[PDB]
Design an enzyme around this catalytic site. Structure first.
Site, PDB file in Angstrom:
ATOM      1  N   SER A 130       2.034  -8.808  -3.246  1.00 40.51           N
ATOM      2  CA  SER A 130       2.597  -8.098  -4.416  1.00 40.51           C
ATOM      3  C   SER A 130       3.380  -9.100  -5.280  1.00 40.51           C
ATOM      4  O   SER A 130       2.783 -10.147  -5.629  1.00 40.51           O
ATOM      5  CB  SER A 130       3.428  -6.922  -3.953  1.00 40.51           C
ATOM      6  OG  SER A 130       3.583  -5.983  -4.997  1.00 40.51           O
ATOM      7  N   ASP A 175      -5.627   0.196  -5.636  1.00 39.59           N
ATOM      8  CA  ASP A 175      -4.254  -0.254  -5.881  1.00 39.59           C
ATOM      9  C   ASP A 175      -3.755   0.400  -7.162  1.00 39.59           C
ATOM     10  O   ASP A 175      -4.383   0.120  -8.227  1.00 39.59           O
ATOM     11  CB  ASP A 175      -4.216  -1.770  -5.985  1.00 39.59           C
ATOM     12  CG  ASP A 175      -2.815  -2.351  -5.969  1.00 39.59           C
ATOM     13  OD1 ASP A 175      -1.863  -1.646  -6.415  1.00 39.59           O
ATOM     14  OD2 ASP A 175      -2.713  -3.538  -5.501  1.00 39.59           O
ATOM     15  N   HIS A 207      -2.523  -0.780  -2.431  1.00 37.24           N
ATOM     16  CA  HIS A 207      -1.495  -1.846  -2.519  1.00 37.24           C
ATOM     17  C   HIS A 207      -0.925  -2.165  -1.132  1.00 37.24           C
ATOM     18  O   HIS A 207      -0.509  -3.296  -0.931  1.00 37.24           O
ATOM     19  CB  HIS A 207      -0.373  -1.429  -3.469  1.00 37.24           C
ATOM     20  CG  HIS A 207       0.421  -2.605  -3.911  1.00 37.24           C
ATOM     21  ND1 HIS A 207      -0.127  -3.608  -4.690  1.00 37.24           N
ATOM     22  CD2 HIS A 207       1.714  -2.957  -3.676  1.00 37.24           C
ATOM     23  CE1 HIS A 207       0.824  -4.505  -4.967  1.00 37.24           C
ATOM     24  NE2 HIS A 207       1.967  -4.123  -4.377  1.00 37.24           N
TER      25      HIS A 207
END
EC number: 3.1.1.74
Length: 258
Positions: A130, A175, A207
């Site tokens: 991330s 995601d 994600h």
């Protein structure tokens, strides 16, 4: 003849579980370091060889503990891995890049004797989840000597990284935090055409896919690290003319297969 080569001739199956090295861990207190929030070192034991180092950053709100599975997975395949905590859980991606840098310096210089005994400080790489993946892209740009960079479901506001460091990006089709068309895909496309690069997108993944053991993330992360940190050409087989049903997007400029 390859002095950095470790472990048996790889199979895809072998790269979906912990590898042939026993792993020891060392907790790095926040108090004991500066420039990052401590974390944990995962390193091979029962071996008289040395290995390349990887620093890895978690994402926004997260800590190193979330990516422990991947610290153990990478170390067990023959790497010294330091998964960091950040100074603040709210640090953005460029801050994470600075903190990965401090972590590599600590890894090479002030980590325990037993850790530096197993480390080839000349062969270092970065990975992250991330915002940690955004910081992976940024530190790659800042530290050209790094052998490899693996951003996992990366997030950054900056879409263009002028790095020469070989990059493999993992996207996740579902995601919603760092949608692939606004993050993973433009990062890949905007990297220099001269830089060895690969984009893979996980089918049926979100994600949070890197926060738990994931066969595809293990295969591509181990393979990219092996190929570039260790010059281990045996891992090309996983990266070259790939047909993986777990992948929904595959992109490369084909600078890694020869």
């Amino acid at each position: 003849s390859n002095p950095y080569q470790r472990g048996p001739n790889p199979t895809r199956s072998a790269l979906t579980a912990d590898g042939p090295f026993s792993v020891k861990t060392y907790t790095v207190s926040r108090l004991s370091v500066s420039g990052f929030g401590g974390g944990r070192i995962y390193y091979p034991t029962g071996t008289s060889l040395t290995f390349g180092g990887i620093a890895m950053s978690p994402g926004y709100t997260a800590d190193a503990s979330s990516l422990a599975w991947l610290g153990r997975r990478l170390a067990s395949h023959g790497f010294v891995v330091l998964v960091i905590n950040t100074n603040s859980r709210f640090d953005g991606p460029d801050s994470r890049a600075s903190q990965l840098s401090a972590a590599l310096n600590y890894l090479r210089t002030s980590s325990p004797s037993a850790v530096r005994a197993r480390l080839d400080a000349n062969r270092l790489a970065v990975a992250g989840h991330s915002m940690g993946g955004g910081g992976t892209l940024r530190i790659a740009e800042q530290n050209p000597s790094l052998k490899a960079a693996v951003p996992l479901t990366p997030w950054h506001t900056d879409k263009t990284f002028n790095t020469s460091v070989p990059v493999l990006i993992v996207g996740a089709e579902a995601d919603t935090v760092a949608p692939v068309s606004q993050h993973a895909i433009p990062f890949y496309q905007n990297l220099p055409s001269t830089t060895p690069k690969v984009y893979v997108e996980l089918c049926n993944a979100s994600h949070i896919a890197p926060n738990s053991p994931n066969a595809a993330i293990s295969v591509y992360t181990i393979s990219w690290m092996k190929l570039w940190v260790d010059n281990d050409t045996r891992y090309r087989q996983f990266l070259c003319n790939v047909n993986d049903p777990a992948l929904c997007d595959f992109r490369t400029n084909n600078r890694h297969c020869q």
